[PDB]
Design a binder for this molecule. Sequence first.
Ligand code: ADP
Ligand code: MG
Lengths: 371, 55, 55, 66
Amino acid sequence: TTALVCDNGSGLVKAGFAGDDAPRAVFPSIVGRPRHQGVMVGMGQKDSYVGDEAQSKRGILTLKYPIEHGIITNWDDMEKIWHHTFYNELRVAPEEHPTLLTEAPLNPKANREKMTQIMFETFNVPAMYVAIQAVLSLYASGRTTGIVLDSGDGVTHNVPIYEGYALPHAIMRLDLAGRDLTDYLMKILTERGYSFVTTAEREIVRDIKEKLCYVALDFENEMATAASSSSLEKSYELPDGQVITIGNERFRCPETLFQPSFIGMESAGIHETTYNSIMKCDIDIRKDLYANNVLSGGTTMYPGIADRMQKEITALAPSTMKIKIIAPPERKYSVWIGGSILASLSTFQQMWISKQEYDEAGPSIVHRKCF
Amino acid sequence: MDAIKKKMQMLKLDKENALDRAEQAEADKKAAEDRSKQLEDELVSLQKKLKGTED
Amino acid sequence: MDAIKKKMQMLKLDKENALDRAEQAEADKKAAEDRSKQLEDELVSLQKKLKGTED
Amino acid sequence: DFDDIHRKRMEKDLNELQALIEAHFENRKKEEEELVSLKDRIERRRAERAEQQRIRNEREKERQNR
Ligand SMILES: Nc1ncnc2c1ncn2[C@@H]1O[C@H](COP(=O)(O)OP(=O)(O)O)[C@@H](O)[C@H]1O
Ligand SMILES: [Mg+2]
C-alpha cells in the first residue's frame, strides 16, 4: 500500500500520500473553543473547530496553537488535530497506512516517545517512522551534501550534512522563527496607532506580514530612505475596511532574523549561526558546504532574503570561497516533498518501526536502531 | 499576474546558471594560465642551468 | 505594457553576456592548456639533453 | 542523484510556461470581449427600460392630475 507522509510542523500541517509533488491538504494547526454564550438553539454548534474551519469562524473563537516551539505542549489538542487530518482532510483510515512524521532536531525525548505511543495506540497505524526535518529538505533539493537552514514557523535549525554523513556536533538550533516575527510586527504596528490584541487578530497581523514585509538588502540605507521619501508606504485593507499604511515597519519586522537583539534575544542572526555551524565542521568539507548552502522552510520566503544572506556570508567567509545560496521556488513544501521522496524509496522500506517491534520494546524503541 | 511571474523566474534561473558558468570558466582560465606561466619559468631556469653546465 | 519588455530584454542580455564571456574564457583555457602541454614536452627533452651534457 | 533535476525542472521550464500562456489567452478571449459586449447589451436594455418608465410615468401623471 501507500504511505502517509504527514508533517506536523508548527503553524501549517502538511499531509499527503507518498509519491506526489505537493501535499494534498494544507491547513493551519489551530484548535479554537468558542468563548461567548450562544443563544440560538439547534444551530448545531460544536465544542471545538479545528483546522481550516476555525480560520473562518475566528471572530468568536479563541484559537490556540498546540505546538509552541517544535515541542508539543497540549497533547489532547494535537491528538484532535491528527484525527482531523486523517479522517476529514484525507479520508483514509490509519489502520492500513504507514506514517512518516517529522521532528525538529534537539527536541525533548518525551515528545517523540509520546508521539509514537499515540500513533501506535490510538490511531493504530501499521508502522511509523520519525525523521529529522532538515534531511528531508536536503532530499528535495536532489543534493547529497550541503548545510540546510530550515527556518520554519516554530524553530529555526541549521543541520550541516556531507556526503550523507550528518555532523551531530554542528547542529545549531535557534528558537527565533515566524511566530516571533508575527509578535514583533504586532508590537511595532502600535507605533502608528493600530492595536491588535485578540488571538484572532494575530492572524490578521500574520497576513500583513506575509503580503507586505520584505528583507532589506542594506538596513541603514533603507532606514534612511524610508525616513525621507514615501515610496515605500504600502497600504492594506483590513477584514472590515479602514485601510492601514505600513511605512518602515515593512523591512523592520523580518530584520529581526539577522539581529535577534530586536526582540531581546542574545544570540546572533541567521546570517552568523550558519557561518558558525560551518566553522565547527572539519577543515576539508568547508568549501562544499559554502557552495551548497540550502534554504528551506516557510519563513525563508521573504522577498530579497537570498541576496541579503549571501551578502552577509560573503562578508564573513574568506574571500576565495564561492558562496552560493540554493533557494528553490517550492521552498514552503520542501520538507514534505523530501518526505515523499524518502517514503517512496525501496531501500528505505525496511526501516519502518513495525508494530510487533513496538510491542516488544515499548515506546522507547524510537531512540534505538530504528531512529 | 500568474504566468508572467513564472516566466520571469525561468529567465532568472537562466541568468544565475549562465553567470555562474561564466565566473567558473574565468576562474579556470586564471588557474590554467598561471600553471602555464609557472611551467615556462621553470623551463627558463632549466635553460640557464644548462648554460652554466655548458660553461 | 512597459515593465515586462525592458526587464525581459535586460535579463536575456545578461544571460547572453554571461554565455559569451564563458565561451571566451573556455577557449583561452583550452589554448593555454595546449601550450602548457607543449612546454612540458619541450622541458622533458631539455632535461634529457642537460643530463647528457652533465654526463 | 542530481540526474532527476533535469527531468523535473526542464519539463515545467517550457510546458508550464506554454500552458499558462495558453490559459491566459483563452481566459482573456472568453472573458473581456464577452463582458464588454454583454454590458453594452444590458445598457441598451436599461435605456429601453428608462424610456418605458418615462412614458408610463408621464401618462399616469397626465391622467391622475386632478
Ligand atoms: N509567502 C510568505 N512570505 C512570508 N512569510 C511566510 C510566507 N508563507 C509563510 N510564511 C511564514 O511561515 C510560516 C509557515 O511556515 P511553515 O514552513 O509552514 O512552518 P512549519 O515548518 O511548521 O510547516 C507562517 O507562519 C508565516 O509566518
Ligand atoms: Mg518545517
